[PDB]
A paper describes a structure:
Complex I is a 1 MDa multi-protein assembly that is central to mitochondrial and cellular metabolism. It oxidizes the NADH produced by oxidation of carbohydrates and lipids to maintain the redox state of the mitochondrial NAD+ pool, reduces ubiquinone-10 to drive the respiratory chain and oxygen consumption, and pumps protons out of the mitochondrial matrix. This proton pumping contributes to the proton-motive force that drives ATP synthesis through oxidative phosphorylation. Here we define the inhibitory drug-target interaction(s) of a model biguanide with mammalian respiratory complex I by combining cryo-electron microscopy and enzyme kinetics.
Substantial evidence of disorder at the ND5 lateral helix / subunit NDUFB4 interface was observed in preliminary maps, so the dataset was subject to a separate local-first classification focusing on this region. The strategy yielded three major classes: one with a typical well-ordered ND5 lateral helix and NDUFB4, and two with distortion or disordering of ND5 residues 547-564 and nearby NDUFB4 residues 77-92. In Active-1092-iii and Deactive-1092-v (referred to as displaced), a short portion of the ND5 lateral helix is altered: Lys547 to Ser550 are disordered, and an interruption of the helical structure at Leu562 to Pro563 allows a short stretch of helix (residues 550 to 559) to move outwards, away from the complex, and laterally, along the membrane plane. A loop in NDUFB4 at residues 78-83, which usually wraps around the lateral helix, becomes disordered from Pro77 to Leu91. Overall, ~65% of the protein population was perturbed in this region, with similar proportions observed for active, deactive and slack (~52, ~66 and ~58%, respectively). There are no density features that can be interpreted as a tightly bound biguanide nearby. Considering the positive charge on IM1092, it may interact with ND5-Asp554 and/or Glu559, thereby disrupting hydrogen bonding from the lateral helix to subunit ND4, or interact with nearby stabilizing phospholipids.
Residue numbers in the entry:
A (entry chain Z): 49 to 144
B (entry chain B): 26 to 179
C (entry chain J): 1 to 174
D (entry chain X): 1 to 114
E (entry chain A): 1 to 115
F (entry chain a): 1 to 70
G (entry chain e), H (entry chain K): 1 to 97
I (entry chain H): 1 to 318
The structure:
């Protein structure tokens, strides 16, 4: 009995996994736009906040390469509410 | 005022007399009739009376048997190590007043030379039923305590 | 305040270490190490390592249980020492806490602190990964690879544990 | 070391598919078949370019094909589809195996009409 | 948060019960009442004196066996690997070596307590 | 007789039934009448967070269907 | 290694775990995968004496990915200035920030 | 570096000084050794977890396995030291001066 | 609504524990040809309340020689950790849904051991110390066997999630494919809870009262409450592990009814076993686990690793 | 080279074996009763225990 | 074969626990070799898709690579539907 049920559970897992694969292109497209919007919003705020700082350059890279780098949490949520930062960082780990 | 403390005595008294835990402490013959009170016919446990070996977890000491001079310091010790409130039941002639060894050089003439006694159960030994009568008499003594009523009127 | 969860645990981590490094009675040294194992598990858990965290806590709980038994047999004296009972223990305990406090005070007062080396006090969340949508735990796949990828690691670890039993019996057979 | 080139907020704007995950999960299997071509091209772009900025245009065609997909369901299968994802939505794990009966109704509706 | 809330409530309730237990009852404290218990007669020596462990060798072996579980606990996840030929060999290898270590200590009287 | 032990079992039984019933009811009440969403893996959490944004009322358990597709 | 028996016999005892750009279970990539690969490919075959000098850019970027020291310094600079401007009644954050 | 590293590194240092500055009980020093492994375990785990290097997620586990062997080895020696002198005091281990 | 949920968990537990003491006294009474409490309240129903009130108005004692902080700390851990063991239990929905609920309970149960060690040690009395070191011996006996027994069962479930055990047992109880493990698990839980015939850390007839001989009044009550809360929790865990109740998502109360009956019956069996057998000698407990259960558990562990592979019955990760 | 700090040094044993300590390991002494469930209430059994 | 039987029966009378252990341990080692289902275990583990199936850039000569998920080309899970 345990054999037969676990085979069915493996069949059910694949079905569940295939649904996620079907939606991954849509979620990925949303993720790309959301990250870029957040960074562009971050970039604009940095322009005003650092205006009177002399040596500053707005939107400068720390990397010699021009290749795209995934931003870390501080880079993306650096200038935002604590509860938005908290949910983004520890939301999953803390969820029950 | 008087009404609240009156009910509060009734509650603490009811709990204390409904949950009487004697020390697992027997000395001689009379401890055999103490066993028969725990046995099925009388079933002390049905009244809420439960033996517990540790003095710290005991409310009542039943002095069940002869108290010798050699034993007397030990009996006083475990009595002192009961937390309060605590009660002593003196069971049988030996504990009550030395009994049939009253005139012995090695016997304490009554356990009330060593500890205060609440109830004296006569007999040599008292029947198991007679001891049960003494335990229920101790319960009715506890039912009459007026600790909070007296505190309120201090 | 909650964003600093990992830092607050790390502060209790060090305090536990000062607990047993000051070296009171091993009864209390074991207690200090149990606490550090606990918040040490909490720290690793908050980085996504639930399995790693819970296991270091589990292993150290069994180890200190053996230590407690050995303390009563071989490391006990009439007056076991607490942190307040000895000047050398208290002096070490006090020194470690004051050295811990000041490091905390500056890094919180400034968001950076220099203690031999530069440390950033912006909170530890800033370094976390932003994206994540895999339908599995990464720590679990990495740990589970010990049996497929880590064939060589299993052999050396299995052998060492087997030898450990043989060795301890030789050592203790006077 | 350079100024990261980020697109304008107008170049990022697009019509959003604003439905819950239980809605997406309910239609995932049919959505995978119907919108395969735009989706596969967009995913080929991301794993080749390795840059979200270089794939924006293909990422908009992913949404436009998703909206068209969900617009056809609304025109012909609104009610049967609405029972089905509601059944999915109830489950804490959004399990398929607890909604096989409603999945059928939605499955023969899209077969007969679409 | 929920977990931290749950743990705090549990140990907060326990502490409140202890506080109530210590400040509600009427206390009568004196030396004989608080003296160490030992069946009516004074203790003979300190309870802090060394207490010999007869199962000391089993206790050390527990430390080594108690780490086998950390190596074996990942097995349910390892069963999902593509490389099952290597898995099963290595899983069975570890358990057998653990069994062999147990047999060695058993046959060499390591599990017998010292008298 | 032995069935005089039953009253204490029933009271014990009823006490053990409450935690399971309360949790099931409290979950439904605070999740819009549905089971609480289970997020064991990053993917599930990602979708749950997306639902909170989609809801428009900052609640992952407020669902939006075809009526939100123009 | 001191004795490269692994290369000679062709067995692979521990090289699999040495770098984060190697094959991982289910192809899960490390965060600094691209930076490692660039540095490993820059310095391949030329030796440490040359690599220390001719691959500083690749290594320096890789070090930035690993410890993010330059980034965190930049954020602390931005955050510190906002505190100055917020506290002086000079700048006000927009609703979303 | 990140601020967590400050306290984990400090924790290692505290136990290192703990091990190097002996008192009397040899058991106390064996705890400072288990303290060093605990901090090494934690600090390795943070680095491995944060960087998403999957295959090394087994590394902290292997670290604990060989810490258990050392503790079991250390306790065995403490048994024989105690059986000889009646205590675990380290000042009794000075025959070889 | 979460704080209310926490109180809806722990307050009933303390009520169930209170009435478990009554049920134990009655069940043992009738197996001993007597009645047990039937005076204080009808059928003894008010007896647990009287005992609870009496203890908390009894004078607590701090022994002169005791270590104060550890003396008071120990009962707080005991009750605190006993209640913590319940937060991951799916009944059918857990209060806290953990990925690794099985390992969380293993860690908390290991931590709860120290509430015995430190109470016995802090008491600074010989009978307390002897009881505490029996706890050390008892943990060494069962801990290694207990974890590997769980691992064998989880190889059919595929997860460390407690809720996945409900899904694994949807068509059939796991006691069918694993009754040899259920037997050794059931014994291990008696040893784990210091229950007769393995009630050694207290061991009335040998140690007066063992590790808590110096505890009185409220501090004693916390230890007693922790013990009986652990009895119920470990039988719930046994029921979930081996007697899975089908869960209907639209009628979750039906799960809770069948699930509760199984846990009551398993808890009743603990009382039944206590009335039937003499006590082990504590070195005979060590040999039982290490020389009998451990060799068989190691073999069944290999068997249950291989069986899913050779039958192609490996469960899913989810 | 003799020095005042090494005046108390003796050559090591010929076969490397130092004499066992004359120290007597002390066994725990316990009152088993009289107030004890297994002592019948009036037996003061003084036991010397090793473990 | 007679000497072993006496030993085997002897251990069944003195150490039945250890007889059962070695027997079960022996089966755990042997049966995976002789089982006709062991092959399917790896195939089912292979067929579980944890990752996105990244598409290929069509170059013109990929006859066996499908263009659509529902095309006949590609691995089929029909063996699993009936397992
Ligand atoms: C939950 C809370 C549970 C603990 C409750 C403690 C307070 C209980 C009241 C009490 O202590 O009795 C009165 C007692 C005073 O009565 P006393 O008999 O005169 O005291 C005797 C001596 O003071 C000696 O008294 P002692 O035997 O208690 O020793 C003092 C203390 C040692 O105290 C010290 O030397 C310094 C303080 C050490 C505690 C700090 C944590 C130890 C390191 C772990 C790091 C954890 C960081 C978080 O002992 C300890 O080791 C404390 C361990 C508690 C750790 C709890 C887990 C954290 O304490 C006071 O109120 C003062
Ligand atoms: C599972 C949890 C169960 C918990 C159960 C808790 C008990 C519930 C029932 C409570 C009923 C009231 C109990 C009163 C018992 C008091 C003990 C006693 O009898 O002493 C006699 C004493 C009388 O002493 P006295 O003044 O007459 O004389 C004493 C001096 N000698 C010994 C010489 C005679 O009562 C009192 O002193 C005051 C009575 C108070 C009654 C109301 C309780 C308030 C107490 C607050 C204490 C302040 C600290 C706060 C503690 C936290 C409180 C929550
Ligand atoms: C000497 C005195 C000792 C007295 C003892 C005091 C009681 C000690 C109690 C034990 C403390 C350790 C607690 C460890 C919790 C582990 C539980 C767990 O792993 O799950 C909780 C959750 C992770 O759950 P998981 O499912 O694995 O991953 C998230 C997926 N959604 O993760 C979370 O919910 C986030 C929690 C992070 C904060 C935990 C803080 C623990 C630090 C110690 C306090
Ligand atoms: C010989 C004495 C040994 C003593 C050792 C202790 C043994 C005590 C055993 C106690 C547990 C007994 C089980 C209690 C039965 C209650 C069953 C019930 O009421 O519900 C019906 C149930 C079948 O339903 P269900 O369990 O949900 O289906 C399984 C699929 N998951 O069940 C169908 O029958
Ligand atoms: C015996 C006690 C042992 C205690 C161990 C305590 C923890 C030790 C931490 C070791 C890491 C410290 O790291 C030390 O500080 C920072 C780290 O960015 C570096 O800082 C320096 O080096 C790098 C080199 O590119 C540049 O940033 C720059 O030259 C300068 O900032 C040091 O070159 C490094 O040596
Ligand atoms: C003192 C050291 C002791 C070391 C003892 C080591 C014991 C190891 C015994 C062999 C265990 C594995 O045995 C081996 O398992 C795999 C299954 O995973 C089987 O392999 C079979 O199934 C796999 C997948 O499951 C298929 O890919 C394969 O086509 C098929 O042959 C082998 O036919 C069997 O021989
Ligand atoms: C792969 C997992 C399953 C495989 C089993 C692994 C564990 C094997 C355990 C060792 C078995 C052989 O080793 C064991 O050695 C001792 C010698 O002291 C034998 O003999 C001893 O055992 C029993 C119980 O202790 C005593 O009653 C007997 O007086 C004594 O002679 C055991 O009969 C034998 O069982
Ligand atoms: S009173 Fe009578 S029965 Fe009791 S101990 Fe004395 S002689 Fe024996």
């Amino acid at each position: 009995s345990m054999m037969k049920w676990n085979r069915e559970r493996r069949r059910l897992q694949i079905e569940d996994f295939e649904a996620r694969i079907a939606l991954m292109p849509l979620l990925q497209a949303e993720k790309d736009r959301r990250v870029l919007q957040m960074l562009r919003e971050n970039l604009e705020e940095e322009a005003t906040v650092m205006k009177d700082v002399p040596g500053w350059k707005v939107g400068e890279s720390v990397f010699h390469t021009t290749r795209w780098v995934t931003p870390m949490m501080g880079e993306l949520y650096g200038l935002r509410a604590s509860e938005e930062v908290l949910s983004a960082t520890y939301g999953f780990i803390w969820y029950t | 005022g008087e009404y609240v403390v009156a009910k509060l005595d009734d509650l603490i008294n009811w709990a204390r007399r409904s949950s009487l835990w004697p020390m697992t402490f027997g000395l001689a013959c009379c401890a055999v009739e103490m066993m028969h009170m725990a046995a099925p016919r009388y079933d002390m446990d049905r009244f809420g009376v439960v033996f517990r070996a540790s003095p710290r977890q005991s409310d009542v000491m039943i002095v069940a048997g002869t108290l010798t001079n050699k034993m007397a310091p030990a009996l006083r010790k475990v009595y002192d190590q009961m937390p309060e409130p605590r009660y002593v039941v003196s069971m049988g002639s030996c504990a009550n007043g030395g009994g049939y060894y009253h005139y012995s050089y090695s016997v304490v003439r009554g356990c009330d030379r060593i500890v205060p006694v609440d109830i004296y159960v006569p007999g040599c030994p008292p029947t198991a039923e007679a001891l049960l009568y003494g335990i229920l008499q101790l319960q009715k003594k506890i039912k009459r305590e007026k600790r909070l009523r007296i505190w309120y009127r201090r | 305040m909650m964003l600093y969860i990992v830092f607050i645990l790390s502060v209790i981590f060090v305090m536990g270490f000062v607990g047993f490094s000051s070296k009171p009675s091993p009864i209390y040294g074991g207690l200090g190490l149990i606490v550090s194992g606990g918040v040490g598990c909490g720290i690793v858990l908050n980085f996504g390592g639930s399995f790693l965290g819970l296991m270091v806590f589990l292993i150290y709980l069994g180890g200190m249980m053996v230590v407690f038994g050995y303390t009563t047999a071989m490391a006990t004296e009439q007056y076991p020492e607490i942190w307040l009972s000895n000047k050398a223990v208290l002096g070490a305990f006090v020194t470690g806490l004051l050295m811990e406090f000041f490091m905390v005070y500056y890094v919180l007062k400034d968001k950076e602190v220099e203690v031999v080396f530069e440390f950033n006090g912006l909170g530890d969340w800033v370094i976390y990964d932003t994206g994540d949508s895999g339908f599995f735990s990464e720590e679990a796949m990495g740990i589970a690879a010990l049996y497929s990828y880590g064939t060589w690691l299993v052999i050396v670890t299995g052998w060492s544990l087997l030898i450990g039993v043989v060795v301890i019996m030789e050592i203790t057979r006077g | 070391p350079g100024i990261v080139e980020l697109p304008s907020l107008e170049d990022l704007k697009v019509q959003e598919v604003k439905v819950s995950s239980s809605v997406l999960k309910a239609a995932a299997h049919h959505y995978g078949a119907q919108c395969d071509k735009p989706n596969k091209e967009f995913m080929l772009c991301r794993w080749e370019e390795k840059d979200p900025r270089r794939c924006l245009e293909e990422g908009k065609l992913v949404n436009q094909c998703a909206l068209e997909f969900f617009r056809q369901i609304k025109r012909h299968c609104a009610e049967p589809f609405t029972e089905y994802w509601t059944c999915i939505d109830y489950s804490g794990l959004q399990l398929f195996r607890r909604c096989r009966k409603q999945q059928a109704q939605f499955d023969e509706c899209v077969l007969d009409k679409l | 948060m929920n977990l931290m809330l749950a743990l705090l409530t549990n140990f907060t309730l326990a502490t409140l019960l202890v506080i109530i237990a210590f400040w509600l009852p009427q206390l009568n404290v004196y030396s004989e009442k608080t003296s160490p218990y030992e069946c009516g007669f004074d203790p003979m020596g300190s309870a802090r004196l060394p207490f010999s462990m007869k199962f000391f060798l089993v206790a050390i072996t527990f430390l080594l066996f108690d780490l086998e579980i950390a190596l074996l606990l990942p097995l349910p996840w390892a069963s999902q690997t593509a490389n099952l030929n290597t898995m099963l060999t290595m899983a069975l290898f570890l358990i057998i070596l653990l069994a062999v270590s147990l047999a060695y200590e058993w046959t060499q009287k390591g599990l017998e307590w010292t008298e | 007789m032995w069935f005089e032990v039953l009253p204490g079992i029933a009271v014990m039984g009823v006490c053990l039934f409450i935690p399971g019933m309360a949790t099931a009811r409290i979950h439904r009440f605070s999740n819009g009448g549905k089971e609480k969403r289970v997020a064991h893996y990053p993917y599930q959490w990602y979708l749950m967070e997306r639902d909170r944004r989609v809801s428009g009322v900052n609640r992952s358990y407020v669902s939006k269907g075809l009526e939100n597709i123009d | 290694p001191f004795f490269d028996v692994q290369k000679r016999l062709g067995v692979d005892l521990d090289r699999w775990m040495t770098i984060q750009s190697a094959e991982q279970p289910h192809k899960i990539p490390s965060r600094c995968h691209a930076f490692e690969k660039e540095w490993i490919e820059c310095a391949h075959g030329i030796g440490s004496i040359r690599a220390e000098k001719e691959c500083k850019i690749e290594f320096e970027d890789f070090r930035e990915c690993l410890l993010r020291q330059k980034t965190m310094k930049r954020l602390h600079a931005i955050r510190r200035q906002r505190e100055k401007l917020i506290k002086e009644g000079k700048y006000t954050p927009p609703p979303h920030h | 570096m990140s601020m967590v590293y400050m306290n984990i590194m400090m924790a290692f240092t505290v136990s290192l000084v703990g091990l190097l500055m002996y008192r009397s009980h040899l058991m106390s020093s064996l705890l400072c050794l288990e303290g060093m492994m605990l901090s090494l375990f934690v600090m390795a785990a943070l680095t491995i977890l944060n960087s998403h290097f999957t295959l090394a997620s087994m590394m902290p586990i292997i670290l604990l396995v060989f810490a258990a062997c050392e503790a079991a080895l250390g306790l065995s020696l403490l048994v024989m030291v105690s059986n000889t002198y009646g205590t675990d005091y380290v000042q009794n281990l000075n025959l070889l001066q | 609504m979460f704080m209310i949920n926490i109180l809806m968990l722990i307050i009933p537990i303390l009520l169930a524990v209170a009435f478990l003491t009554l049920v134990e006294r009655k069940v043992l009474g009738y197996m001993q040809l007597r009645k047990g409490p039937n005076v204080v309240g009808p059928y003894g129903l008010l007896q647990p309340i009287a005992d609870a009130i009496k203890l908390f108005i009894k004078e607590p004692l701090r022994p002169a020689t005791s270590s104060a902080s550890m003396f008071i700390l120990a009962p707080i851990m005991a009750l605190g950790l006993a209640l913590t063991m319940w937060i991951p239990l799916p009944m059918p929905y857990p209060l806290i849904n953990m990925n690794l609920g099985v390992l969380f309970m293993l860690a908390m149960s290991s931590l709860a051991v120290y509430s015995i060690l430190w109470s016995g040690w802090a008491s600074n009395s010989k009978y307390a110390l002897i009881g505490a070191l029996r706890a050390v011996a008892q943990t060494i006996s069962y801990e290694v066997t207990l974890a590997i027994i769980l691992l064998s069962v989880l190889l059919m479930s595929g997860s460390f999630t407690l809720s996945t055990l409900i899904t694994t047992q949807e068509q059939m109880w796991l006691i069918l494919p694993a009754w040899p493990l259920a037997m050794m698990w059931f014994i291990s839980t008696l040893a784990e809870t210091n229950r007769a015939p393995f009630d050694l850390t207290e061991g009335e007839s040998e140690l007066v009262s063992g590790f808590n001989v110096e505890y009185a009044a409220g501090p004693f009550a916390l230890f007693f409450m922790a013990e009986y809360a652990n009895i119920i929790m470990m039988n719930i865990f046994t029921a979930i592990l081996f007697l899975g109740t089908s869960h209907n998502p639209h009628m979750p109360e039906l799960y809770t009814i069948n699930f509760t009956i199984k846990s009551l019956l398993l808890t009743m069996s603990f009382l039944w076993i206590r009335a039937s057998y003499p006590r082990f000698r504590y070195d005979q407990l060590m040999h039982l686990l290490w020389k009998n259960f451990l060799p068989l558990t190691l073999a069944l562990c290999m068997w249950h690793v291989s069986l899913p592979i050779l039958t192609s019955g490996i469960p899913p990760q989810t | 080279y003799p020095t005042k700090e090494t005046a108390h040094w003796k050559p090591p044993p010929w076969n490397d074996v130092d004499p066992p300590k004359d120290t007597l390991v002390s066994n725990l002494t316990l009152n088993f009763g009289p107030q004890h469930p297994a002592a019948h209430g009036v037996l003061r059994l003084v036991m010397e225990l090793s473990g | 074969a007679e000497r072993v039987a006496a030993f085997l029966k002897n251990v069944w009378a003195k150490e039945p626990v250890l007889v059962a252990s070695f027997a079960i341990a022996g089966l755990a080692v042997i049966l995976p070799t002789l089982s006709p289902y062991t092959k399917y275990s790896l195939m089912i583990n292979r067929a579980t898709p944890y990752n996105y199936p990244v598409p290929l850039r069509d170059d013109g000569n990929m006859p066996d690579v499908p263009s659509h998920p529902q095309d006949p080309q590609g691995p089929s899970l029909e063996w699993l539907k009936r397992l």
